[PDB]
Swiss-Prot record:
This is [FeFe] hydrogenase maturase subunit HydE. Belongs to the radical SAM superfamily. HydE family. Its EC number is 1.8.-.-. The keyword Protease does not apply. It comes from Thermotoga maritima (strain ATCC 43589 / DSM 3109 / JCM 10099 / NBRC 100826 / MSB8).
């Protein structure tokens, strides 16, 4: 019987980069790009993604100020510190006046988008959110909501109240793992929400965690292909960070390099999308968001949740630095952007269609 030797690894890695540069995004090519463990291949992939980012989204790093206004959640996701079964966390809700005034302060510090994010907290839904959104829209900025899965009628009310964008990370495109990790719901529910949000005219954001328990490289390829299929306006990617007060406490943490390759491939697949350097990337490696901004990301989301709430929004350990004042994050990220040679966004930074 005759032999079947593999190709040399250097020549394989060079061929994969060429396929990516020519935009031949077959499953095998995406799988091999995520499986190669070579510093020189990875650096060339990050440079390709940085090139694409320069050409189709430019040098602005858009600043979105987030206010995490309630840590109450009716769901029980196995990865999240806010899951309802975690009784070892003090819960909070901000008043609408606190939220609106905190948003006004971020606008005065120069944020051109306000992100409102919460647990799935029924107290607010739908009418308290609508009132808050109407007040923030009078400040002349964009509004992004990130409130979870709700009925079409609620999404429609919030669009009429003026909301521009909605971030609903898809978490994992594998439906069997999705149901195991999110026992209240399903990938079909999550996708139907994203489809409803797009049909209503929101700019929509999806995106997965990298390194979840049970997730394989083939699953990460399916996440990339799902993102490509829908041409999402925004994509939020970060590593899974185990939380000690959850069932996943003892599982492996998501790997930084693999997550950065996911960000880089997402930029290559979706050249004009908005891609944050997420909080979780800054949690796992010192300077992690700065690195990610050189590997295809073009958005940063400074934490604008005020004390004493901000330290209770404990999605994962290490998320909040207790050492600086709760107005430090917007000037800090502006300094970071300056030192990278980039500039803050000039307008609201909505996704544009310039590729093709
Ligand atoms: C902190 C500085 C010093 C060395 C720099 C990295 C290296 O240059 C390798 C690589 C080049 C890509 O171009 C962009 C990404 C990456 C990881 C850089 C990111 C970042 O800038 C680093 C970590
Ligand atoms: N342990 C963990 N590690 C990393 N990211 C996590 C995490 N737990 C939650 N997250 C991320 O935090 C995001 C926001 S949770 C708040 C918004 C809303 N309840 C929703 O679920 O969409 C989730 O989309 C998820 O990707
Ligand atoms: S990920 Fe969102 S829905 Fe799930 S428990 Fe956390 S806050 Fe609730
Ligand atoms: C999220 N950053
Ligand atoms: Cl946004
Ligand atoms: Cl921050
Ligand atoms: Fe985020």
């Amino acid at each position: 019987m005759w032999s079947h030797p593999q190709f040399e690894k250097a020549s394989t890695g060079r061929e994969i980069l060429e396929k990516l540069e020519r935009r031949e995004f077959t499953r095998e090519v995406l799988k091999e790009a995520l499986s190669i463990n070579d510093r020189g291949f990875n650096e060339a992939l990050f440079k390709l993604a940085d090139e694409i980012r320069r050409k189709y989204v430019g040098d602005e790093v858009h600043i979105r100020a987030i206010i995490e206004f309630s840590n109450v959640c009716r769901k029980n996701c196995l990865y999240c510190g806010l899951r309802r079964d975690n009784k070892n966390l003090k819960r909070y809700r901000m008043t609408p006046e606190e939220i609106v005034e905190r948003a006004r302060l971020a606008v005065q510090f120069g944020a051109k988008t306000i992100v409102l994010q919460s647990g799935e907290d029924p107290y607010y839904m739908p009418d308290v959110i609508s009132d808050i959104v109407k007040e923030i829209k009078k400040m002349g900025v964009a509004v992004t909501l990130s409130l979870g899965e709700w009925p079409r009628e609620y999404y429609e009310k919030w669009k009429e109240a003026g909301a521009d964008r909605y971030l609903l990370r898809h978490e994992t495109a594998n439906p069997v793992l999705h149901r195991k990790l999110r026992p209240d719901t399903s990938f079909e529910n999550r996708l139907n929400c994203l489809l409803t949000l797009k049909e209503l005219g929101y700019e929509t954001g999806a995106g997965s965690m990298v390194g979840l328990p049970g997730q394989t490289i083939d699953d990460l390829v399916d996440d990339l292909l799902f993102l490509k299929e829908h041409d999402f306006d925004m994509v939020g990617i970060g590593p899974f960070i185990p939380h000690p007060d959850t069932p996943l406490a003892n599982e492996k943490k998501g790997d930084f390099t693999l997550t950065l390759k996911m960000v880089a491939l997402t930029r290559i697949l979706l050249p004009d999308s908005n891609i944050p350097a997420t909080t979780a990337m800054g949690t796992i490696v010192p300077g992690g968001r700065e690195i990610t901004l050189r590997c295809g990301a073009n958005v940063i989301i400074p934490n604008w949740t005020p004390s004493p709430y901000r330290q209770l929004y404990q999605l994962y350990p290490g998320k909040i630095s207790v050492f600086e004042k709760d107005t430090a994050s917007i000037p800090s990220v502006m300094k970071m952007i300056e030192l990278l040679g980039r500039k803050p966004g000039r307008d609201w930074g909505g996704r544009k269609r310039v590729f093709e």
